[PDB]
Amino acid sequence: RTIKVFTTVDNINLHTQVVDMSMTYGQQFGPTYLDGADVTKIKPHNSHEGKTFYVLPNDDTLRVEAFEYYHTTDPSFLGRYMSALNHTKKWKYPQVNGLTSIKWADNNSYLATALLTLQQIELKFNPPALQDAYYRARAGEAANFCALILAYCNKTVGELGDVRETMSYLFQHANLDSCKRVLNVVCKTCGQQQTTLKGVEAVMYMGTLSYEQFKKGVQIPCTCGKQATKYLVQQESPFVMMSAPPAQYELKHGTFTCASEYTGNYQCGHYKHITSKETLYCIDGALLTKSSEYKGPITDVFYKENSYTTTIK
Numbered sequence: 001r002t003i004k005v006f007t008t009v010d011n012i013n014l015h016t017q018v019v020d021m022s023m024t025y026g027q028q029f030g031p032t033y034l035d036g037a038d039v040t041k042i043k044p045h046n047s048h049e050g051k052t053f054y055v056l057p058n059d060d061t062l063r064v065e066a067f068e069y070y071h072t073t074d075p076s077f078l079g080r081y082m083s084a085l086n087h088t089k090k091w092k093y094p095q096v097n098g099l100t101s102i103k104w105a106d107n108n109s110y111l112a113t114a115l116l117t118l119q120q121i122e123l124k125f126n127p128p129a130l131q132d133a134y135y136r137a138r139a140g141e142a143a144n145f146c147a148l149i150l151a152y153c154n155k156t157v158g159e160l161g162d163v164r165e166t167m168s169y170l171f172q173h174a175n176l177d178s179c180k181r182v183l184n185v186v187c188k189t190c191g192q193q194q195t196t197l198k199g200v201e202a203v204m205y206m207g208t209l210s211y212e213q214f215k216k217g218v219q220i221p222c223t224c225g226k227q228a229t230k231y232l233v234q235q236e237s238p239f240v241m242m243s244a245p246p247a248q249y250e251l252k253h254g255t256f257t258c259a260s261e262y263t264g265n266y267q268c269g270h271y272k273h274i275t276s277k278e279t280l281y282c283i284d285g286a287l288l289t290k291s292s293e294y295k296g297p298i299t300d301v302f303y304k305e306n307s308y309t310t311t312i313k
């Protein structure tokens with residue numbers, strides 16, 4: 001007694017298989033998943049005929065397909081992706097003010113604010129798996145995209161996460177080759193040092209949330225033991241992300257694109273998203289509120305950019 005099924009690593013290229021209904025999937029394919037569910041220890045049902053099963057990339061055809069689709073050789077990746085998808089397919093993805101959000105479940109507030117942010121900044125993903133899942137997420141079906149983020153970041157469903165680190169890992173799998181930043185550091189004692197940064201380093205800054213303040217100059221400790229002024233000379237990027245240790249901060253309508261708020265103690269707090277549109281909207285998973293100004297413990301602020309050159313001489 002047999003059925004025909006298909007095996008895959010990318011859910012695009014299918015491989016025809018005939019399975020024995022008296023043996024487990026595990027006995028025939030090794031670790032096997034059906035829409036994220038682990039079916040390794042399960043025997044084929046009638047209802048399985050014609051269905052697609054994920055298997056591990058254990059031969060050269062599957063390794064080429066999996067590497068071209070996911071751009072990772074981590075042998076646990078597909079198992080972690082499937083384990084996460086079994087949960088994320090049960091999350092809800094409401095449209096909030098025209099953006100795909102996530103209804104709160106499993107400590108996912110960092111993923112909701114990351115997903116909302118990605119829909120507001122120009123970013124192209126390198127791995128086809130992320131490109132395809134991101135397109136589906138923007139259309140409202142974000143389960144695959146959320147499970148890929150989890151898998152790529154080595155996070156499990158239910159784990160508390162960091163928005164900044166999550167964005168940094170996603171930026172590392174994105175095309176930021178065009179991104180350039182020139183900084184100047186001026187110490188009235190030591191003199192001045194210019195630095196040029198590329199890629200992820202060109203779009204992320206830690207120590208101030210204010211892009212305006214970064215342009216005017218921020219005070220930092222100099223290696224000589226005094227204080228220096230660091231300021232932005234030149235920026236070439238479609239956005240910048242400014243971060244700082246969480247502190248009470250006032251967001252003003254029309255001065256930024258979006259921001260992350262973190263409330264609570266070390267590690268086990270909660271994120272909300274603030275987006276500047278016609279007014280300020282606070283998106284907290286499924287929840288939406290508005291205000292003319294917003295003051296809270298802000299961690300990350302995103303700004304639109306294209307090309308900036310300082311007037312500072």
Ligand SMILES: Nc1cncc(C(=O)Nc2cccc3ccccc23)c1
Pocket residue numbers: 161162163244245246265266267268269
């Ligand atoms: N998501 C989250 C939750 N709870 C605590 C943090 C936190 O403090 N992380 C950081 C560690 C080290 C240096 C940091 C410097 C700046 C900002 C955060 C830092 C982050």
Ligand SMILES: [Cl-]
Pocket residue numbers: 123124125126130131132134
């Ligand atoms: Cl993309």
Ligand SMILES: [Cl-]
Pocket residue numbers: 071126127172173174
């Ligand atoms: Cl990549």
Ligand SMILES: [Zn+2]
Pocket residue numbers: 187188189190191222223224225226227228
């Ligand atoms: Zn100095």
